[PDB]
Amino acid sequence: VKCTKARYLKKKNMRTLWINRITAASQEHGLKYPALIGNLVKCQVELNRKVLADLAIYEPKTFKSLAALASRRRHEGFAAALGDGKEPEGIFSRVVQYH
Amino acid sequence: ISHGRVFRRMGLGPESRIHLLRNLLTGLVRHERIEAPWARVDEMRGYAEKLIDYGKLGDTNERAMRMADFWLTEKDLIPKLFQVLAPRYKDQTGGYTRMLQIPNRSLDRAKMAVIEYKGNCLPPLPLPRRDSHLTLLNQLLQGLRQDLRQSQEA
């Protein structure tokens, strides 16, 4: 019975581990976990947490690039919010439309 | 607590203890060598030493005769005490008996001792002998002694 129910916990614990590892990597670049994940989505980067945790460990230069991209998109959000609509959309804020 | 309690608690009480010790002492006087439990031999050894002192007072000392009459349950041994054992130790002030531990008793594994009156006619016990003066250690110490004596006379 324990073996059966553990399949739920295995999935839960794995994702918790990825978030802890992603959180650690993000803090090394001065970014909080919610800021990285949220802004990557707004760039249409759909990398999941498993891959993001793997990149932090084995591809640290790519991860810094992703952290930089999220940081850039985050600052574009602030500029837009502060403006009254006069400003055009940020370069990285433009969304690719599909049909 | 039993601080300074010099006597053991054996037998069925104080009277029985004396009777137990008296029987051992009577056997010792007759045979001059007996084996018994170590604790009981150790207890009796003091009485066996003092009995000789009473024997040295002589058979004309009425107190000595009463002491010997009580402690020797076989009356033929009273002449032996005054005329055989006590004269043998005329030139000693003590150390009339020797007590040595022997292997544990077979049945109950009781610690055992052999006790005898010194100077008996029986085959001698295999007494523990100290190492010879000719051993390596004893010779090195003899040299050290010789040297010190030579330096003092100078």
């Binding site: - | 033929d76 002449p79 032996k80 531990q101 292997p103 029986l122 295999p126």
Partner: protein, 110 residues
């Protein structure tokens, strides 16, 4: 008061096999020089003591034959004399218990 639960073999092995429960090795065993049999340093050799007792018992049986009854203890000293020996000047006036064997080497005449 009764045992509320059975004690497991794991618990029992810890109690039984604890070093306190084990038999301690003895470091005071040495060879006897006279006979070669083992002895403890503070205890008389069993083999040698038995030999002495056997001779003592034989002499005591001879003393009994001379006494020939109870309450017949002598008033003089005693000397054991073996075959081929005669009383010395110092053995005069002493009851002579004769043994029908050669004097044991360990038994020294005095």
């Amino acid at each position: 008061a009764a045992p509320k639960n059975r004690r497991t073999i794991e618990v029992n092995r810890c109690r039984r096999r604890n070093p306190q429960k084990l038999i301690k090795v003895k470091n005071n065993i040495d060879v006897c020089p006279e006979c070669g049999h083992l002895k403890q340093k503070h205890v008389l050799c069993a083999y040698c003591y038995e030999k002495v007792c056997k001779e003592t018992a034989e002499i005591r049986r001879q003393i009994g034959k001379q006494e020939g009854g109870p309450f017949k203890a002598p008033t003089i000293e005693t000397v054991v004399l073996y075959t081929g020996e005669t009383p010395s000047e110092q053995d005069q006036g002493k009851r002579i218990i004769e043994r029908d064997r050669k004097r044991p080497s360990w038994f020294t005449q005095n």
